[PDB]
Amino acid sequence: EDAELLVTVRGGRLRGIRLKTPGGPVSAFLGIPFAEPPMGPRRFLPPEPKQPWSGVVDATTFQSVCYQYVDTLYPGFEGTEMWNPNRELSEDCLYLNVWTPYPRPTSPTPVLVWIYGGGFYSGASSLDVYDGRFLVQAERTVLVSMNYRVGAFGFLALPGSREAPGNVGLLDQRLALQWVQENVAAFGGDPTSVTLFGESAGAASVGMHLLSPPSRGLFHRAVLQSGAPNGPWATVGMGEARRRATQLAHLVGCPNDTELVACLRTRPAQVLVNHEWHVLPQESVFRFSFVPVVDGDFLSDTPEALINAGDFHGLQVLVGVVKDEGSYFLVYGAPGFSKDNESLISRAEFLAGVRVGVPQVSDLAAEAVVLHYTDWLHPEDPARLREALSDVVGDHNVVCPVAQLAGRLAAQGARVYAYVFEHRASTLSWPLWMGVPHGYEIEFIFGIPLDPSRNYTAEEKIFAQRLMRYWANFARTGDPNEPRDPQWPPYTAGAQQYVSLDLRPLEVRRGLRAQACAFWNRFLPKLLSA
């Protein structure tokens, strides 16, 4: 038997599995329980630490995916399916995975912790695109990823109530981070060097852990990919959380918070999922029903406020976006869009599209969006309208919240690095008009192109290797840069420098869509407040 694959953690003994990569083997421990199954009376409640077990837990395979909506927009299409659950759905889903070099490191190795995105309504650590084996082999880190509750199960909130306090999916993440502090050394990992990285809702999660003091002692550096806690989709107010929870109860035949939650607890998980999208107040894209709530507890204030008022000396952060953040979302609700045509929309469709991309703002606010995003020498040109609406959704939801986060953090003591990821995968099956869509840098960060059984080019493999080195350098030192030879400069509120990530050497540029983001970050709030 293989002693490298036997580990004892606080709760008992584990058996892992040896995995192959083109660079040699790696040790994997998959499906380690970190909480009691949040089932029955535990639905909607904070996670409880997993009670110790006797005998040996089989950690050789991924565990169940937390209950979630399954994307059926284009049935069979690889582009949507690669994000869907690839294991059975269950509420018994609170497991985490550890990948480590082979044989296990016998000295403290820097730890990367992955938090997946999926708008807080979906995602899983078991997805192919999140395979930790290549990063661990190539960069000799320890990699941890956890499942956390999503949708109503993780984020349904009746603020003030004990039966559904909200944010429990965030607590699932915190408990996993505490698990890492207590157990990662048993795998060769160094609990004093833990870097969080996440994408979209995962990035927003990372940011929220930054702004919540009980989490802040569980890690040392942060990476936010295409997401930020201050995104207009990433939190919801107490009032609206209560309304959405109340409408869900109504839609599934339930009626006093105690009674309401008790009736919800009797419903099959799938039933809650089937009505999830229906509690959204207006037609939209890039909006999700059950998200982190600002209730004074996990988040003592809005992330915007907490950001603006924070002291971030001692912090290093890596943040960035893809080239076309908004394009992907247009096919889920914008009139005139399809992955199967050029989506060359009309001015009228563009105008309707704006209310969908920017839901629940006043007509005046919408008018201001149309003003900024119209080229008044070509107001009706379909291609420009397509690009512009992509820009609206992308700037509003991702780029400008990330820019604002980066500016405030840098101006308040943090060292920030910024990137735009500008390579379109040769294997990408979404149409060319989408450019580089949301989510499509991840496979490169994880070194998926190194997988011989996939169709990436030789250059793409080298690129993935560069990216893995940047990310792991950052985890190790707080600085992505290799030894001098073009350098990646820190982002600051003034110079606003970032690099382009693609097949070409690093290129330094200025401004994360500064003109557009001045509108979203500086002007538009003032307008709304009047």
Place this chain on the structure above:
Amino acid sequence: EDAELLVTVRGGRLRGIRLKTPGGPVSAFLGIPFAEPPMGPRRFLPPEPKQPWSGVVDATTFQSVCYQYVDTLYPGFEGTEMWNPNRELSEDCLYLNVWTPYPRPTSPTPVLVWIYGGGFYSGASSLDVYDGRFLVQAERTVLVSMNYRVGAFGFLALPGSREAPGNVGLLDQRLALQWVQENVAAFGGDPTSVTLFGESAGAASVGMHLLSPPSRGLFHRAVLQSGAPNGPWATVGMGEARRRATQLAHLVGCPPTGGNDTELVACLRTRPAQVLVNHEWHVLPQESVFRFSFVPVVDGDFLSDTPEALINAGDFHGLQVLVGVVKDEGSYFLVYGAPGFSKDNESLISRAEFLAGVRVGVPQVSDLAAEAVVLHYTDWLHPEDPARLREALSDVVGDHNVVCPVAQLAGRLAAQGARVYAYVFEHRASTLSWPLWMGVPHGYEIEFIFGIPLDPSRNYTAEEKIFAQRLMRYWANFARTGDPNEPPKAPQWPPYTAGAQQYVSLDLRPLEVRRGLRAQACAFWNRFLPKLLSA
């Protein structure tokens, strides 16, 4: 006596003068009375037609400049002095001028009627830069210009009252236009072919005549240079006009605030002209530039609704219009009140000075409105670069006051039947004494349109002389045909339309066609900002 210099008009006989020009003789009839003098009891009142006279009136020199403020910002500086009165100030100022070819035209000749600018508070038809001799000689048109009352004398309004109804300066202009209809034939002019042209406040006046039915029958074509009736400086509401009128009276002791209008006006009529003028700038509610105390009032009479409304809801089929702006409409105004500015230095302002300048250049709007202006005119990759800030403030003042109002008028007119032509004037005169940072400032295309560079005593280059001849040709072609284009191989000046938005650059180089009159900027001022002010 010389037969060419004798003309009979409806009021009596006139004797003129023979003028020399580089290209041959011109007849000029300068200082023809067209109204009874608005003296004493007639102050603030609509002009009365000049009573007929016996004998011969000598129309041989420019008459008095209408009473007005005299600009003292840079005493002795030619850049400022050239706009100041060059005849004595008098309320007895309602005279016009006719220039005609020598010998007098055998067949009816197209007429150009000039209306000077000057913010409705200043200006005169006697200024050297409005000398009509060259246009008449070069292009064989008849040229008319009139004096009209300005400042309180022309535009103080107590809306409703018969004693100061407002807009009398515009009535001065109309009376002169009626005089052109009744009398221009006697000089060989065609009353069926009359083209109005004006610059700044004169351009805005031209536009108002377009929007006022009793004026509309008096002309056929219009030219608006760097001004529009819909500019935020060009009109004022009834209540604000009354407030300014009342404050003026108060500041000069009338009555011994408000009360009976009849009495308030009667007390105002007893004040010396210069006393009114000395307090004129004091009635402006906030610190500003490009704002003038007494301007046309929207009172439902001369203007039955706002110029914006009238434009938007009008039929302009059968109308030809030529409109345009200079390259740097805003720069001139900054030295009259924007912090940090001077003609004598580079005016490389700080961000703080820029922000303060914004409130001066866009006075009396909400903090939110101002923030919207700062957003659209800040380069957020270079938010504090002094030169960029200087240029930005210039654009703010220029766009808001001139370019965007002109663009809006041009687009609405085109889309509603009018054939429209648009230019941007991009030549900086070799003789310009204002500093280089001002570029091509407000007012400095006029001298070229009038052909002033053909004046031997002046020191323009040969190219500038050639350029002047081109412009005069364009303007006269438009006057004659409603189309500035040469009736060959020469580059064509296409109509301006709401969609293509084509205009030409006018400078030493040949016509270059371009798109959009500050389109991105003007979408802010014309489409969005008004919605923000309603909410």
